[PDB]
Ligand binder design. Structure first.
Ligand SMILES: [K+]
Ligand SMILES: [K+]
Lengths: 369, 370
């Protein structure tokens, strides 16, 4: 019969067998890491599937621990009486295909007894969706009430709705576009270059070598983190202030740092301790090939042809997925009644920070379901 | 007698002696590279000083040629009948202190016969103004009719106007802010890190070693280039198209590149062949140190106290020095009657591309200097 759902901090590892990718290549022996909160209803029709973003994982809520290097990335969104109210809904989240937090990816051991590494194939967002759908099938779940996500999570949710409109009752698509843009591919390809030019990248087969491309991954994360924040907030929070230490300001003209510089350095250092460079490359490449129109006659035809009820949200200060992209989605999707604009200074990261606004968008989506 | 001004493509190398910087550090034996166009008046009062931006040089107009690895970066702005009309004005431009196109910088040889390299002291925008003023004095010039610049050049022009209001009759401050911002220091410090973490940076003393931090400088330039362009521009020009070469389209599902990726790579590759990594770091740190308010009671006090008439311009699509920064400049400077908005898809780089718009701003400025 079906595999049982885990609960809470517990990760279930769901084998889905060999999978055929959009490219026609095959990945053998794929395992999908899954977490869940709330009881699955008898008819298995109350699932809210949460698609995590580029550097997040299946741990949507909960504490950090030996199984969870980071705490929940959407704290308070899932729980009793929360937006995803676990008294009524069953929240489910996977780690994306190509990830490094339990699902098969570059750090995983392959059949030949060596890390996947450079042998891990290129994947698309559609491959990621179909791996999640396959995992749900192994859990006995053949439809979802809603699929929700922001950023790369929004790309997954959008493709899911377009690919499986008869198996989704509603979707939340937050802070993403219908396809990768020139600016996105520009910065993302530069981040990949920072990793791959690091001497310890070793062609991507550094796993188990004792060395890793930490300097390159650190730089890649710093590049990305700026794209995730708002321009004004960076100037009001940091401006050109020096870093303030316990007993006073540093001197940026000597050995000291600017406050924004110290902030970015700390973000980069923490990230390298928590994330795999090869996964970062695979997942960033999947974002570069995000395109809901591919094989479907273009973006307009694909979106106009999707009947799923959809809440589309965008953020005023988002510099990576600017509001014009969500205006396009909201216009073209016939199941979207109009763009929801999140007013926030926090840039793209507002979808993680603006608790009340995001809760309202999630509640609206589940009401549609 | 005062040193003679050069003309046209000719570079003059003006010694100004040893200089003490704002930090207290010293640079021995500073030499400033200078170019000039047009005749200096008998009163020596018709100089229009052009401040170049981060990766530009003294060669404001003219072709690439035997002595100029790049052609003029503001072609058509200087000449007979042009916006800087050499029938009336004497245009002068230096290579900035810390640069790598003729003026003393980290590639220059120090008194021990090795490049300054890691010994080159960090400079501020104010140091760069003081060095240009010192070079002008060696050329017999103690005042300028106008000082003009965009981007880093705008920071130099703004500081010059605030520092020497008695010796400037007008300024053009284009596509810059009153101080470095959080986002600017963020991206600039990351560009510096790309260079300094390169395995061949060697603390900045890579010269003559057989290894150089070209890969890191290439990455730094790609990061910067994105900040210089417009978001919509990049999506309309490249979108997610694959690169097309002589033999057809590349395939990003395998080893091929996207068109925007190939564009950035090519920009980086060309750049590393004609710019020095240590100079890039020094000049980028000078931008981190830009702050017209320092030692003057803050930005608002410094700007409100500047009596120079100023044309402030900003670009609608600029992502590095967004329009809100020029709105602040235009509001606080009493010599600005209102922001001039340049409509362009090209982002920050519009100040180099939008010739008609920039020509108009330069003409407006020089009319205020008369
Ligand atoms: K619609
Ligand atoms: K004013």
């Amino acid at each position: 019969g079906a595999m049982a759902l885990p609960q809470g901090d517990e990760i279930a590892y769901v084998p889905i067998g060999s999978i055929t990718l959009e490219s026609g290549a095959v990945i053998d022996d794929v395992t999908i890491a899954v977490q869940s909160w709330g009881e699955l209803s008898p008819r298995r029709d109350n699932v809210v599937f949460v698609c995590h973003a580029l550097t997040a994982d299946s741990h949507v809520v909960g504490p950090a621990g030996p199984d969870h290097i980071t705490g929940g990335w959407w704290e308070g969104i899932i729980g009793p009486g929360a937006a995803i109210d676990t008294d009524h809904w069953c929240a489910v989240a996977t780690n994306v295909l190509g990830g490094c937090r339990g699902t098969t990816g570059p750090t995983s051991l392959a059949r030949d007894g060596k890390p996947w590494g450079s042998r891990f194939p290129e994947v698309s967002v559609r491959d990621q969706v179909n791996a999640d759908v396959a995992a749900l099938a192994q859990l006995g779940i053949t439809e979802v009430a809603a699929v929700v996500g922001g950023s790369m999570g929004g790309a997954r949710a959008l493709e899911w709705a377009v690919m499986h409109p008869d198996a989704v009752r509603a979707a939340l698509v937050l802070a993403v576009g219908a396809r990768a843009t020139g600016d996105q591919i520009g910065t993302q390809s530069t981040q990949i270059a920072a990793i791959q030019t690091d001497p310890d990248w070793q062609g991507g087969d550094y796993h188990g070598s004792g060395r890793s491309p930490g300097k390159g991954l650190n730089l890649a994360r710093r590049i990305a983190h700026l794209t995730y924040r708002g321009e004004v907030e960076l100037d009001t929070r940091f401006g050109n202030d020096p870093q303030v230490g316990p007993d006073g300001p540093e001197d940026p003209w000597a050995d000291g740092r600017y406050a924004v510089q110290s902030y970015l350095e700390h973000q980069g250092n923490k990230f390298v301790r928590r994330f795999d460079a090869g996964s970062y490359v695979i997942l960033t490449e999947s974002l570069n090939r995000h395109d809901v129109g591919r094989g479907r006659g273009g973006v307009e035809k694909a979106l106009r042809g999707c009947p799923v009820p959809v809440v589309v949200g965008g953020i005023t200060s988002d510099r990576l997925y600017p509001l014009r992209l969500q205006e396009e989605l909201a216009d073209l999707l016939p199941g979207c009644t109009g763009l929801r604009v999140v007013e926030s200074v926090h840039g793209h990261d507002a979808f993680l920070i603006e608790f009340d606004a995001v809760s309202e968008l999630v509640r609206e989506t589940l009401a549609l379901a």
